[PDB]
Ligand binder design. Structure first.
Ligand SMILES: Nc1ncnc2c1ncn2[C@@H]1O[C@H](COP(=O)(O)OP(=O)(O)O)[C@@H](O)[C@H]1O
Ligand SMILES: [Cl-]
Ligand SMILES: [Mg+2]
Ligand SMILES: [Mg+2]
Lengths: 19, 358
């Protein structure tokens, strides 16, 4: 998969368990 | 998931000309009876059967020879001869119409680490540490052996770890994903089963090493200690979040070691959850220690299998006065060969206790 696409999803998910 | 791009007599007797697993190709007539399926999947069918001559039970793994992919399973198994790897006795070919299937005649082993762990789970008990030690140690020995030939299993998981509960002997099986890794030659990233996939594989690395098997092993260990998989999740992202939630966000350097293409993204910084809080309070410190040295982001920082065997967690297995809970003695554990110890010969001082020399 595209690193950009993979990273965006991961960043999005990590923000949710962080906040 | 996938890798890179007969006569009948009278019980009912099946006779085939099969080629022995070891040595030069010298096929011999083999007869068996009492065939039944003990496993079925999209890969093919696995049968139990009894050899007519010896009466010994065997497993017959029947796999379709798909020419669209690279099939190294037979080629790899034939070269393997180790007490912690399931024995290939014979192989033969047989006829989906207009198709040819590969048959692997293996020693029959009744249980797997997965089924055994499931028992404790539904009983709400944990596998006694002595077994965690025994199983993990034998797994690492098998890994040390295959890695010494440059062979990476690529599918380490409890379902691929056969057990003889009476003798407590573990045998690694399923070399359908295995491959000899060569530096400079790229590999398939979508390898290894969910829950057991190293972070570098999830980040899509194609230049990984045999240390991915060590990560998988660390997952098995953690799972046995915990009573469930430590990093579950359907997708890679799901799995990486679980990983991060334990290990903390990987640093840029750790990311670079896994896959350099991800070094510049700004990942939210999640704090690591202490390994001592991950497991139950009665978990042995040396098991926690071992686990943390297996489940490392930086693949080169992971213990080698031989180093793992030498870890203090397995010190009990080197005590001359140990025994299985059923009364019997432990399996062979110290009969290391020059091949097995090749990655680090001085480790023999630890791996072979004085009472094992005689
Ligand atoms: N030698 C054996 N003895 C008994 N059961 C086996 C043996 N080999 C495999 N099995 C069982 O059948 C399944 C077959 O899968 P395996 O050989 O691991 O390859 P694949 O996962 O590609 O089908 C295993 O999960 C295991 O439970
Ligand atoms: Cl956090
Ligand atoms: Mg399998
Ligand atoms: Mg397979």
């Amino acid at each position: 998969v595209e690193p950009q696409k993979f990273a965006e999803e991961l960043i999005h998910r990590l923000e949710a368990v962080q906040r | 998931r996938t890798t890179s791009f007969m006569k009948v007599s009278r019980s009912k007797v099946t006779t085939v000309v099969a080629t022995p697993g070891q040595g030069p190709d010298r096929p011999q007539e083999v007869s068996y009876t009492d065939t039944k399926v003990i496993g079925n999947g999209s890969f093919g069918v696995v049968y139990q059967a009894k050899l007519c001559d010896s009466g010994e039970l065997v497993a017959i793994k029947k796999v379709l020879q798909d020419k669209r992919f690279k099939n190294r399973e037979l080629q790899i198994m034939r070269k393997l001869d180790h007490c912690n790897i399931v024995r290939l006795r014979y192989f033969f070919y047989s006829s989906k119409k207009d198709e040819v299937y590969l048959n692997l005649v293996l020693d029959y082993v009744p249980e797997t680490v997965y089924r055994v762990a499931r028992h404790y789970s539904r009983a709400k008990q944990t596998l006694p540490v002595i077994y965690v030690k025994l199983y993990m140690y034998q797994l690492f020995r098998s890994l040390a052996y295959i890695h010494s030939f440059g062979i990476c299993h690529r599918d380490i998981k409890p379902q691929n770890l056969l057990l003889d509960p009476d003798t407590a002997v573990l045998k690694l099986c399923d070399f359908g994903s295995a491959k000899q890794l060569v530096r400079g030659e790229p590999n398939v990233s979508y390898i290894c089963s969910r829950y057991y996939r190293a972070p570098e594989l999830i980040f899509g690395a194609t230049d990984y090493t045999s240390s991915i098997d060590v990560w998988s092993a660390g997952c098995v260990l953690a799972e046995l200690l915990l009573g469930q998989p430590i990093f579950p999740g359907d997708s890679g992202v799901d799995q990486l979040v679980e990983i991060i939630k334990v290990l903390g966000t990987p640093t840029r350097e750790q990311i670079r070691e896994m896959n350099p293409n991800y070094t510049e993204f700004k990942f939210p910084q999640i704090k690591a959850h202490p390994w001592t809080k991950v497991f139950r309070p009665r978990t042995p410190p040396e098991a926690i220690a071992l686990c943390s040295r297996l489940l490392e982001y930086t693949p080169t920082a992971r213990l080698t299998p031989l180093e793992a065997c030498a870890h203090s967690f397995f010190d009990e297995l080197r005590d001359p006065n140990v025994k299985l809970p059923n009364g019997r003695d432990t399996p062979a554990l110290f009969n290391f060969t020059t091949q097995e110890l090749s990655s680090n010969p001085p480790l023999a001082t630890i791996l072979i206790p004085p009472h094992a020399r005689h």
